[PDB]
Amino acid sequence: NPSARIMTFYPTMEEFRNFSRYIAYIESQGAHRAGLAKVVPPKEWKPRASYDDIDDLVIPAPIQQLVTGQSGLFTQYNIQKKAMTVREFRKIANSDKYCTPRYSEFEELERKYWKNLTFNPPIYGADVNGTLYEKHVDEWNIGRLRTILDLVEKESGITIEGVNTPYLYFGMWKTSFAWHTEDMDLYSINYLHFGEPKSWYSVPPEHGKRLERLAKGFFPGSAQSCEAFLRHKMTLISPLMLKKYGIPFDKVTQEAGEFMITFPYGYHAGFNHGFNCAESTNFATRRWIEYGKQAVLCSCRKDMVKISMDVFVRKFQPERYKLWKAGKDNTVIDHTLPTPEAAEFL
Numbered sequence: 612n613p614s615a616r617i618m619t620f621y622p623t624m625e626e627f628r629n630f631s632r633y634i635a636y637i638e639s640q641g642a643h644r645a646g647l648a649k650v651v652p653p654k655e656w657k658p659r660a661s662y663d664d665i666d667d668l669v670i671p672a673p674i675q676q677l678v679t680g681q682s683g684l685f686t687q688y689n690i691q692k693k694a695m696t697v698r699e700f701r702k703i704a705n706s707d708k709y710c711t712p713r714y715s716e717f718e719e720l721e722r723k724y725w726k727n728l729t730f731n732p733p734i735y736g737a738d739v740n741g742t743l744y745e746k747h748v749d750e751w752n753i754g755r756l757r758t759i760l761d762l763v764e765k766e767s768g769i770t771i772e773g774v775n776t777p778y779l780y781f782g783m784w785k786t787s788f789a790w791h792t793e794d795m796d797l798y799s800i801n802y803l804h805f806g807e808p809k810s811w812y813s814v815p816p817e818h819g820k821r822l823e824r825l826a827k828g829f830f831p832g833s834a835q836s837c838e839a840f841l842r843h844k845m846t847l848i849s850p851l852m853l854k855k856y857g858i859p860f861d862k863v864t865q866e867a868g869e870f871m872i873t874f875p876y877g878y879h880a881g882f883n884h885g886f887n888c889a890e891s892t893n894f895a896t897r898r899w900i901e902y903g904k905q906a907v908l909c910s911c912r913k914d915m916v917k918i919s920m921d922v923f924v925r926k927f928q929p930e931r932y933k934l935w936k937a938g939k940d941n942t943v944i945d946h947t948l949p950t951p952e953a954a955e956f957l
């Protein structure tokens with residue numbers, strides 16, 4: 612993947628079954644270089660028999676998304692609304708006020724999104740603690756991926772909502788996720804359970820730094836008040852701005868039944884097309900350990916999520932533990948390099 616473009620994969624069920632092993636595989640094919648990959652699961656795989664029974668799930672903290680800005684640069688402000696069922700949510704999503712406009716091609720819809728972003732604030736059913744996987748789904752169950760991320764809770768008892776536990780997202784048209792990498796620069800997995808698509812922008816990890824340097828110049832206030840101000844997940848930048856300032860990026864549209872994977876230090880943003888439901892969580896491979904150790908974290912206390920790297924460095928990098936602890940570990944990350952578990956396929 613020398614061009615670092617977004618790759619899509621179509622595994623059989625035999626290949627699908629072992630999750631960490633398929634991640635090692637797609638990295639053996641260069642997937643991680645894009646920062647984002649699509650995995651279309653096998654036809655016979657479903658995480659849930661039906662979604663008919665969720666009209667009464669509470670969205671405890673729906674968020675109205677107020678967007679201020681102009682000329683491709685915007686900041687999103689969150690207003691917490693009162694708790695709402697998914698049934699109340701969907702009525703509002705599909706009503707005339709909030710529903711998806713009529714469009715021909717996706718490029719038309721994308722245009723309307725960037726034109727109308729600051730108008731008619733939508734509500735995002737974001738960050739809902741839960742899963743829509745049935746108990747017995749063993750393949751790619753976001754509730755239990757069985758990656759080395761599990762060592763956090765194993766060792767310490769610590770669970771971090773949405774990081775080592777699942778989050779559900781009920782979208783409506785024009786609801787947004789701002790530019791970010793994952794907390795601790797982890798991987799993420801996103802499954803779109805049902806509804807209208809979710810569109811994604813991705814910057815390759817090898818160019819992530821150029822993106823942060825540009826964002827610092829575009830929002831200099833924010834930069835002086837926080838090292839990692841993009842971790843607040845309030846910063847929207849249009850693809851035309853990225854392209855005007857020479858940031859490589861790719862785009863892709865996720866459809867119901869599809870998984871997206873994001874990779875360590877892969878900056879992504881996007882928006883929902885209409886009423887939908889996504890489930891996501893973070894995960895890790897051995898390659899992530901170095902990203903974790905090196906992650907530039909929020910210094911102003913808006914983003915509190917911080918994982919102790921000690922257990923990972925002790926277990927998987929015992930040579931460098933005393934050096935690392937003396938603060939002498941000057942390893943440079945090579946973003947093109949697949950995870951060690953990928954040697955099997957290389």
Ligand SMILES: O=C(O)CNC(=O)C(=O)O
Nearest residue numbers: 780788799800801889891
């Ligand atoms: O769906 C959303 O709001 C955003 N999802 C992600 O950023 C992810 O899965 O990493």
Ligand code: NI
Nearest residue numbers: 792793799879
């Ligand atoms: Ni993300």
Ligand SMILES: [Zn+2]
Nearest residue numbers: 837909910911
């Ligand atoms: Zn901060």
